[PDB]
Amino acid sequence: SQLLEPCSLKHLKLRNRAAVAPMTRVSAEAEGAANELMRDYYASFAKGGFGMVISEGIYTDTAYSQGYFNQPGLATEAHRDSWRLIVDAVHDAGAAFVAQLMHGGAQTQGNIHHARHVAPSAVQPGGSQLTFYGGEGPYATPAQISEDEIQEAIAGFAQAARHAREAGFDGVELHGANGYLLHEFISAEFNRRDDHWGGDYLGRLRLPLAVIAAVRAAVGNDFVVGMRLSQSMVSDSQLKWEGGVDEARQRFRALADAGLDYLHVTEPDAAAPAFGDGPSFAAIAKGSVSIPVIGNGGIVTGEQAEKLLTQGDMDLVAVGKAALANNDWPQRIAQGLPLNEFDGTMFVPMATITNELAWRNANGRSAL
Ligand SMILES: Cc1cc2c(cc1C)N(C[C@H](O)[C@H](O)[C@H](O)COP(=O)(O)O)c1[nH]c(=O)[nH]c(=O)c1N2
Ligand SMILES: [Cl-]
């Protein structure tokens, strides 16, 4: 019942507390524009009753930001205009639509402008490239990003956010998670800089704080700006935030107090303790800031979502795999209908919309 309670997010009035989590589908045009297949794809979640749809990570600039081939952008006016009809379709079905803004950093696998990658420090990520986005084998070692490249990246977030607002999105989500550029700056392991972008766990927030400030100047004070945060990285799902609960509370507070309107946190298991003992990562955030907290990670069933909301571990519930398994997830929960089990073969060999549609046709598994 709490899942189907309306809520407010700044000036936005959301019909329920169900959100579609951001998911990279590498189904845009080769030079970054969104398209009609993406229109139908995103509209389907809105028709399925989600109160809020968060886009896949959208790149921000025409320099290093693009992380995957056929990833959409918001860097140019052509990119902006290509999203308009998608925004309109999601809105016509009654969902708010938030543009996730992301810079690939050290986790880039394909970028049409450069083979060179940039990161706070020249440290190769561990793990291995995600083949279903295009690419195989070890991550490249990134070049240490320069002050001029940092300023270009900040300006790109601001411009992409202004483009999101102009295209009609209801908000932006700054991608500070999952091992991408902003998270690399947050992290102790990968931000080894000795300048004013490095330091202790608070000093390392300076780049995300600068991005928040620049974005807020570009979009004004009435537009929704959130940030996604995680301990995990795509290159290392076991990584922890330095310290424990108290240092986590301080990061959440610093970022929120810079003028975010929500936090979105993601963990391998949203219900598990963040630091081995004690509260979940989402619960820590919700107990340290007044703005809404969207939680995420392994939330599959209606009962699981309801438990997280009714226990006070989060204000909204973002689902990825469950939304792909049933685009009408919130409606099916209300009707007591069974859910489909998520089946990762739908992403083989590339996680594109086209491959999903072929898989659904072969398996009789309608999204709605
Ligand atoms: C195909 C695909 C693509 C992406 C993701 C996932 C999947 C399956 N995830 C992570 C996603 O938002 C979510 O956090 C995880 O899938 C875990 O939550 P669920 O268990 O799926 O509810 C992700 N997260 C994000 O912040 N930006 C992104 O672009 C993507 N890309
Ligand atoms: Cl850290």
In this structure, which residue's CA is closest to atom 28 in ligand 1?
Answer: 23
Closest CA to 256 of 219, 284, 225: 225
Strands (E), 60-167: 96-102, 118-119, 143-144
Q: Which residues pair with 97 in a beta bridge?
A: 53
Q: How many domains does the chain have?
A: 1
Cα separations in angstroms, 279 against 245, 286, 287, 308, 313: 8, 10, 10, 12, 8
Candidates 24, 54, 58, 229: which one to mutate for ligand 1, based on the most atoms within 8 Å of Cβ? 24
Of the chain, the end-to-end C-alpha distance in Å amounts to 21
* Resolution expressed in Å: 1.3
Closest CA to 171 of 180, 179, 162: 162
CB 201 within 8 A of CB 247: yes
Select which of 41, 42, 68, 180 is catalytic.
180
Orientation angle between helical segments 147-167 and 206-219, nearest 10 degrees:
40
Q: Domain span at residue 227?
A: 1-368
**According to the entry, how was the structure determined?**
X-ray
Closest CA to 144 of 184, 113, 99: 184
Tell me which residue has tokens 């947050």. 186
* Ligand 1 closest atom vs CA 268: 17
Centre a 10 Å sphere on the Cβ of residue 140 and count the other Cβ atoms it contains: 18
* HSE-up of residue 28 (Cα within 13 Å, Cβ side): 29
Strands (E), 21-76: 52-59
Give the H/E segment covering residue 184. Answer: helix 181-186
* Ligand 1 closest atom vs CA 173: 26
175 is in an annotated binding site: yes
Active site residue 133: no
Tell me which residue has tokens 């073969």. 345
* Ligand 1 closest atom vs CA 342: 21
243 CA from centroid of ligand 2 (Å):
8
Q: Residue 209 in 3-state DSSP?
A: helix
CB 154 within 8 A of CB 101: no
Ligand 1 close to Cβ of residue 297 (< 6 A): yes
